[PDB]
């Protein structure tokens, strides 16, 4: 039985009048308090949002505006926790418009290295993943693995690793993963496996051993050969320690 059947809650009426100006202010603490209020007072209490006839794509596009561009890392952290709350308490809503409105902003902001902030950004990326499985994430997650910032590479690749452990096998073997497996997924994971940095390379080694686990260590034996014998035994190390 789906426990979600409990009656749903509505939050649109909860918002205050002084809010759009507060979030769109020059003073950081105005923005912080504005976000922090609707999160602790309006979102954190509830346990199910209103599926029927509720347009959050005005609220969610201003969470994206701050998660991407807002210079206050604190305003980022409290916004991604709001984004997670929406995606968590309102499952099966973020089909495209919602999911895509916050996706590419979130991937840009993995650049943040502060533990508390990387905690919140990634956990929100886990929320959209668990309810927008490989809709747009696979196409856009790869894009930002190719990005110039070192931190966004290791984190968006760790993201593909997170998603891959929770992968779905519905339908035959012509899912979105196989349509783009060798063409895109593997060609992009090798760019991580062959990075200049070790901590970057070491994420690829897991993100390749979690790949083999899903799609057969025989299918990918072709790019295995082109890889160093020295990197091979690191990849195999994770293959032995990774579950499904």
């Amino acid at each position: 039985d789906p426990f979600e059947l409990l009656p749903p809650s509505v939050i649109l009426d909860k918002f205050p009048a002084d809010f759009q100006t507060r979030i769109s202010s020059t003073k950081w603490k105005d923005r912080v308090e504005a976000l922090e209020e609707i999160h602790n007072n309006v979102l954190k209490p509830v346990k199910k949002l209103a599926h029927k006839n509720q347009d959050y794509s005005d609220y969610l596009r201003v969470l994206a505006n701050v998660i991407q561009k807002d210079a206050n890392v604190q305003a980022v952290t409290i916004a991604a926790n709001s984004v997670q709350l929406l995606c968590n308490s309102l499952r099966s809503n973020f089909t495209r418009s919602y999911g895509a409105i916050v996706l590419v902003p979130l991937l840009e902001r993995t650049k943040e290295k502060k533990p508390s902030v990387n905690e919140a950004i990634c956990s929100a990326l886990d929320a959209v993943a668990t309810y927008c499985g490989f809709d747009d994430c696979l196409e856009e997650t790869l894009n930002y693995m190719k990005h110039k910032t070192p931190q966004v590479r290791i984190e968006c690749t760790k993201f593909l690793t997170r998603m891959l452990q929770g992968w779905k096998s519905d339908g035959p073997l012509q899912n979105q993963l196989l349509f783009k497996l060798l063409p895109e997924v593997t060609t992009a994971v090798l760019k991580i496996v062959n990075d200049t940095q070790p901590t970057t390379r070491n994420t690829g080694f897991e993100c390749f051993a979690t790949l083999m686990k899903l799609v057969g260590e025989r299918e990918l034996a072709d790019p295995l050969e082109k890889l160093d014998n020295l990197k091979k035994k690191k990849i195999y190390e994770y293959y032995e320690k990774v579950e499904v």
């Binding site: 210079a71 910032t149 931190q151």
Partner: protein, 424 residues
């Protein structure tokens, strides 16, 4: 590996920064108008490193500092676009520099950094001067570093960070700001020269016999040290030529990249050095802890790597002999498991005023004494939770202080480990 982009942030940043430009502009023969009036090719051989006009960016939240620089002697030479200044100041609040006010301005700074880097044949890396006890130099500087680290990860990051001491400012939040900043530098920079105000006062007071040193007096010791360590970078030379090669031969473990600088001879502001020192005398200003710019005793630790820079006309044969001597006559103080860990280099052009000089860059485990002092002051403050509402109000979390406390103590333990290590 040619050009270096320079940055100075905060009050102290622009003070010792401008002093540095004063010194090496003279050494390179550039006037305040920006015209060459030298008389040697060894001067313009590697002028493209620091000049184009300086490749210098000036930053502060305090807008007054703008004029304190331009109204200075060489204040006319800096590019007007490269001045990037805020409206209000940080007021000794690291959080204001790193999260709130300094973060709002940091974009404008990166735009100028980009512009100067855009027109570089081949960039080497960056160079930041700043104080650690402040709010702007520490908070916005360390934030600028990470923002560059991620925008330019294929480049070197080299900082001239000055440590606060009660002997120079009685502000008690400086242990907070400096500890939080060291938590950044150990993770974000390839090499950092540790300038200790504690040691600058003890040198001006005890060795130079000045009863009350001013900033200018301490800044004289700093600007001369900077030109000394950057001698290899600015003139032709085989050894420690570029930033990366230096750090490669100086930093054996990524976190332990905090150099204890020191140089000789110690002179006053425009005093007379009647008899130029001999080579064995200069050499015997290395272990001499009264010449270290960081308040640490090399006798209480062990050297991992050492770089010596002798400036002036002198016997290369005698320098080699004296350096090879002092190493083996104190063999218990240099780590055995790193062979040929001391490296010497000579430059014929001396620094202005002096006939001979010698700079002594050292990665000594004794530097743990410095981090001990900051940590005990930080913890004494933090256990009573004083002034925490400043930082927490600006969006910081109390947890951050605990992490920075523990991370610096791990840094201390690491230095202690390699000190007690054996080759056997």
């Amino acid at each position: 590996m040619r050009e270096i982009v320079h940055i100075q942030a905060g009050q102290c940043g622009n003070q010792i920064g401008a002093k540095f430009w004063e010194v090496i502009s003279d050494e390179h023969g550039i006037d305040p108008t920006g015209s060459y009036h030298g008389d040697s090719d060894l001067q313009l051989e590697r002028i493209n490193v620091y000049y184009n006009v300086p490749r210098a960016i000036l930053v502060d939240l305090e807008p007054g500092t703008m004029d304190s620089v331009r109204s200075g002697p060489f204040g006319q030479i800096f590019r007007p676009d490269n001045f990037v200044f805020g409206q209000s100041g940080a007021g000794n609040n690291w959080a204001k520099g790193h999260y709130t006010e300094g973060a709002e301005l940091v974009d404008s700074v990166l735009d100028v950094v980009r512009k100067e880097s855009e027109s570089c044949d081949c960039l080497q890396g960056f160079q930041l001067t700043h104080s650690l006890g402040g709010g702007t130099g520490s908070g916005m500087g360390t934030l600028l570093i990470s923002k560059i680290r991620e925008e330019y990860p294929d480049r070197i990051m080299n900082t001239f960070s000055v440590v606060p001491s009660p002997k120079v400012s009685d502000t008690v939040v400086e242990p907070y700001n400096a500890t939080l900043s060291v938590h950044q530098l150990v993770e974000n920079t390839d090499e950092t020269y540790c300038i200790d105000n504690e040691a600058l006062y003890d040198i001006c007071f005890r060795t130079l016999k000045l009863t009350t040193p001013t900033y200018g007096d301490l800044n004289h010791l700093v600007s001369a040290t900077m030109s000394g360590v950057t001698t290899c970078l600015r003139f032709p030379g085989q050894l420690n030529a570029d930033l990366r090669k230096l750090a490669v031969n100086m930093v054996p473990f990524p976190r332990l990249h905090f150099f204890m600088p020191g140089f000789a001879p110690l002179t006053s502001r425009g005093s007379q050095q009647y008899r130029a020192l001999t080579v064995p005398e200069l050499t015997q200003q290395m272990f001499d802890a009264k010449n270290m710019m960081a308040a640490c005793d090399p006798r209480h630790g062990r050297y991992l790597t050492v770089a010596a820079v002798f400036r002036g006309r002198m016997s290369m044969k005698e320098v080699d002999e004296q350096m090879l001597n002092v190493q083996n006559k104190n063999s218990s103080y240099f780590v055995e498991w790193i062979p040929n860990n001391v490296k010497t280099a000579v430059c014929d052009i001396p620094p202005r005023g002096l006939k001979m000089s010698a700079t002594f860059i050292g990665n000594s485990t004794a530097i743990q004494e410095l981090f001990k002092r900051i940590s005990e002051q930080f913890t004494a403050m933090f256990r009573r939770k004083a002034f925490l509402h400043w930082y927490t109000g600006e969006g910081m979390d109390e947890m951050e202080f605990t992490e920075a406390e523990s991370n610096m103590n791990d840094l201390v333990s690491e230095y202690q480990q390699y000190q007690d290590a054996t080759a056997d």
